[PDB]
Amino acid sequence: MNPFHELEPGPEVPEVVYALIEIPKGSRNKYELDKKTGLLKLDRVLYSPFFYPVDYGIIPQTWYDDGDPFDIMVIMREPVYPLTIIEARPIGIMKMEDSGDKDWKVLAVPVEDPYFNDWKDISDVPKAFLDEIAHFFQRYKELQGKTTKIEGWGNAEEAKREILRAIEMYKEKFG
């Protein structure tokens, strides 16, 4: 099966979405779903000694301007394993470009973790913890000669707007 194709975007879109984690926090290896089989594939080894500061994944049955599934970042105190589904609550969206491609990424918190019960919008996140995620994606492909532009952070109301548009975009392409 291809969990990107088979799974639904979420049980209560857009307040709660399904996050399919490809990369646990602390990983220097970059993974992604093999578009053919849906198995975990090593994309590359980060050219620098950086690690994903967040549990990285995608929202199933979503498509975005950058020709990929919609990227999502989930804050987990304990990193999960690849190909795990999390019920998460979007709280914001990171606005960045990559080689002219709009590579925006939803930021989200888990619903079933009471530690984040009061995290509902971007302002609830420590400012330092936003700067760190921005600096990761600003620099994690420098030694690959790639230039990245961090444009800003949107609030929870915009993050949900983009998912509804990524959900449609998928229906348009594969529907």
Added chain:
Amino acid sequence: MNPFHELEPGPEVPEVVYALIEIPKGSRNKYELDKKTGLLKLDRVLYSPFFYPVDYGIIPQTWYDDGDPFDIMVIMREPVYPLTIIEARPIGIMKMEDSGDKDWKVLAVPVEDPYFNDWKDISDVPKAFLDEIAHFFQRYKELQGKTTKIEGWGNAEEAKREILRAIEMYKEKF
């Protein structure tokens, strides 16, 4: 595929059973299987700083009184990855109720680790180990307001009977 439905209960029931692990030892994220897809899911982060004292999973093609597959606990020296199949030897069963539901759990050891070759019945497990587990499940939902009762441990003869009953509960429901 949903592994819970496609795998036989074991190669030699009830002496040896398959343990499909969902939660490695040392984990605090509580995982389960998605009935629709068979993928690993995040059930909940344990509200307390406790970690599963054992490799925790289910026995495929089983059904129990509490409306769920039969839980099995396997004592691994090194944790396995989720969704890994273990050929284990049952040695006992923990009799606990959870919110009024009969939620007994088989305790087992791996066949393929000679460390546990001499482990065969519940008496063979250090008392201090049987206490830590019973305390884990007694309390790992306390902050959630849920009440769990630890009745005690049954021996290997008992745990093996329950397996056969849980098997007969699966063929009956599906």
Added chain:
Amino acid sequence: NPFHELEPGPEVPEVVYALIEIPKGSRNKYELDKKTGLLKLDRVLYSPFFYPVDYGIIPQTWYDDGDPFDIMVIMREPVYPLTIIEARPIGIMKMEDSGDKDWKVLAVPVEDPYFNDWKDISDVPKAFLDEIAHFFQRYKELQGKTTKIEGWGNAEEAKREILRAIEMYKEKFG
């Protein structure tokens, strides 16, 4: 089943798929349950050794010892089981296991610039080739088995056996 349906590689024999079954640093020995494709615990290595490499199989291959072709990938950070790697062969290990031709490819990840200049067996520090062979020489000693390390062949010979392993499979199943 990933072994049966994945291709052998995006550019064989120069770039092959490595389907990892055992991440580096693991004392457990995991193999693919060939009937479902799920990970399965073969056996806990009787001795305190850990796999020195990311160990797996090449899909749609079949070798003289009656199993998918073994391949070893030198990863700095070990991956998770069932992870695909596009690797480059730089050598091969020649060893007899119980009288069966049990050769294993040695390769590096294509997308790790650290190993950019690793193109043949000779670019590997000798002491590393000495640690792998010793692992396999003794990792089944307490089990009563006998493994015989013959030597190391170069890349030209590993790519051949890869092609000769892609055919046997077509002959065995195609």
